[PDB]
Amino acid sequence: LFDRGVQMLLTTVGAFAAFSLMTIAVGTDYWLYSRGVCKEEVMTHSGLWRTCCLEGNFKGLCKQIDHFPEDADYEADTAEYFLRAVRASSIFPILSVILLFMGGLCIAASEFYKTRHNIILSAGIFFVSAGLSNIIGIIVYISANAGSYSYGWSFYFGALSFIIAEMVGVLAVHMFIDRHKQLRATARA
Amino acid sequence: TYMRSAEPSVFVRTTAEGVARVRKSKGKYAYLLESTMNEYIEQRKPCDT
């Protein structure tokens, strides 16, 4: 909002924080708190790949998530199959992870070859797209849930990583406006 | 002719396993049984038919 060095530092630290939070969110098996089984129904903490027990006779023995359950899964329509494929493969959380990493690389590499004026816009677009991918992934995960529960901290880790990415993306493109604004100012004089 | 071409065979050896396939299908299988017996189960346990 003021100066450039701090604003550079603020954007970089925000991008790194968003990347770390989102990477933790993807790799943490604490997304959903619901009653279930880790092999009778009991309190379980779920993620995207494994779900263990809480307050159970054994503690911390997860299984692979039954993305395609056996024993008469009953099948479903093409849209439901598509949704199950997205939820199982987690393409949107991972795609957002990739976009966040790419934007972090772009902003980090901006300190090299300052002349190229589209790398910062590329970083901003990458961060904005990562935020949109976060929205889509959260929505698809919650929809797959509905198919007494509470969400784990890692789900809220990935919820704030969308807010930070958009606030980083807002600043990143804002830097593109001002640094291009200087070009007109020096051209007029 | 469909039960001839129904692979796997939809025929049930006993009347107990006929309803058993129904409760394990969740609306994907229909059972042809006597009407008097049918009115029993629809009020009998597990009250899902």
From Swiss-Prot, chain A:
It is a multi-pass membrane protein. Coiled coil: none annotated. It is found in: Membrane; Synapse, Synaptosome. The keyword Cell wall biogenesis/degradation does not apply. Its main location: membrane. Brain. The keyword Membrane applies. GO terms for biological process: eye blink reflex; membrane depolarization; membrane hyperpolarization; nervous system process; neuromuscular junction development; neurotransmitter receptor localization to postsynaptic specialization membrane; positive regulation of protein localization to basolateral plasma membrane; postsynaptic neurotransmitter receptor diffusion trapping. It comes from the Eukaryota. GO terms for cellular component: AMPA glutamate receptor complex; cell surface; cerebellar mossy fiber; glutamatergic synapse; hippocampal mossy fiber to CA3 synapse; postsynaptic density membrane; Schaffer collateral - CA1 synapse; somatodendritic compartment. GO terms for molecular function: ionotropic glutamate receptor binding; voltage-gated calcium channel activity. Keywords: Calcium, Calcium channel, Calcium transport, Glycoprotein, Ion channel, Ion transport, Membrane, Phosphoprotein, Synapse, Synaptosome, Transmembrane, Transmembrane helix, Transport, Voltage-gated channel. The chain crosses the membrane at residues 8-28, 89-109, 119-139, 157-177. Regulates the trafficking and gating properties of AMPA-selective glutamate receptors (AMPARs). Promotes their targeting to the cell membrane and synapses and modulates their gating properties by slowing their rates of activation, deactivation and desensitization. Does not show subunit-specific AMPA receptor regulation and regulates all AMPAR subunits. Thought to stabilize the calcium channel in an inactivated (closed) state. The L-type calcium channel is composed of five subunits: alpha-1, alpha-2/delta, beta and gamma. Interacts with the PDZ domains of DLG4/PSD-95 and DLG1/SAP97. May interact with GOPC. Acts as an auxiliary subunit for AMPA-selective glutamate receptors (AMPARs). Found in a complex with GRIA1, GRIA2, GRIA3, GRIA4, CNIH2, CNIH3, CACNG3, CACNG4, CACNG5, CACNG7 and CACNG8. Interacts with GRIA1 and GRIA2. Interacts with MPP2. It is linked to Defects in Cacng2 cause the stargazer (stg) phenotype. Stg mice have spike-wave seizures characteristic of absence epilepsy, with accompanying defects in the cerebellum and inner ear. Belongs to the PMP-22/EMP/MP20 family. CACNG subfamily. This is Voltage-dependent calcium channel gamma-2 subunit. The chain holds residues 3 to 214 of 323 of the full protein.
From Swiss-Prot, chain B:
The modification Phosphoserine is found at S25. Detected in forebrain. Detected in dendrites of neuronal cells. Expressed in the pyramidal cell layers of CA1 and CA3 and in the granule cell layer of the dentate gyrus. It is found in: Cell membrane; Postsynaptic cell membrane; Postsynaptic density membrane. Induction: Down-regulated in the pyramidal cell layer of CA1 in the hippocampus by global ischemia. L-glutamate binds at E34. Ionotropic glutamate receptor that functions as a ligand-gated cation channel, gated by L-glutamate and glutamatergic agonists such as alpha-amino-3-hydroxy-5-methyl-4-isoxazolepropionic acid (AMPA), quisqualic acid, and kainic acid. L-glutamate acts as an excitatory neurotransmitter at many synapses in the central nervous system and plays an important role in fast excitatory synaptic transmission. The postsynaptic actions of L-glutamate are mediated by a variety of receptors that are named according to their selective agonists. This receptor binds AMPA (quisqualate) > L-glutamate > kainate. Belongs to the glutamate-gated ion channel (TC 1.A.10.1) family. GRIA2 subfamily. Homotetramer or heterotetramer of pore-forming glutamate receptor subunits. Tetramers may be formed by the dimerization of dimers. May interact with MPP4. Forms a ternary complex with GRIP1 and CSPG4. Interacts with ATAD1 in an ATP-dependent manner. ATAD1-catalyzed ATP hydrolysis disrupts binding to ATAD1 and to GRIP1 and leads to AMPAR complex disassembly. Interacts with GRIP2. Interacts with GRIP1. Interacts with NSF via its C-terminus. Interacts with CACNG2, PICK1 and GRIP2. Interacts with GRIA1 and SYNDIG1. Part of a complex containing GRIA2, NSF and NAPA and/or NAPB. The M4 transmembrane segment mediates tetramerization and is required for cell surface expression. This is Glutamate receptor 2. It comes from Rattus norvegicus. The gene is Gria2. The chain holds residues 693 to 741 of 883 of the full protein.
